[PDB]
Amino acid sequence: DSCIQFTRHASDVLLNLNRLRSRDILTDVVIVVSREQFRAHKTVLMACSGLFYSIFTDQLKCNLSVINLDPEINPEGFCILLDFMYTSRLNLREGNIMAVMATAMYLQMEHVVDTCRKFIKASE
Amino acid sequence: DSCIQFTRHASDVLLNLNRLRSRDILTDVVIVVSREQFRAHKTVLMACSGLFYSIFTDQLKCNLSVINLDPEINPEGFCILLDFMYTSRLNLREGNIMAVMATAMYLQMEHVVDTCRKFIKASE
């Protein structure tokens, strides 16, 4: 086509979706990771994660307001990944990289799994 | 912070949100523009438009599944703007610029209003 494109549009949209999350506006699911609870928007979760895409395209699970993750999942790892979904920024540290990579494999977030593998390889 | 950032994340999220729209997955509102109907995600509309942000933060309107726009709004202009919300690309043409600018003013989409004003000024 002959469209023009606003370079910052996608980043500005994501910033506004994170502001809605902050302010608990139109959040429609609670993700439970053992004793912790995280409120989010199903569409953002599906857009970032192959696991959430599969969950919320299921004709029964699409209607659930609570999703319980596998008890082996680390709440801090999940929190770091949820923040990445809404901001593009990943708080990857020596002390959390193993939990973050394991969580990203479970959530099916291939680009995160990729940077974790590279950071681990560099320290070996 | 000491975060790393994935450059393409925001664009990839927006591409996936447009794929959900295409496939009518988790759309939660119908926008009526006279005889036409457009299905969308409230959160994407709020993230792009000051008018939708105000509508869906209202304690009563947040719960509506149908929103009727002012009868003066052009359906093609709305369609072009809805596509822009989900893709960052604006199909601005000599034949639609007046309707697109009027619709963007109504929807409170300041960057679109800005490029329309500039394109109009250049032809004068």
Partner: peptide, 4 residues
């Protein structure tokens, strides 16, 4: 705004 750019030509994509």
């Amino acid at each position: 705004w750019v030509i994509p």
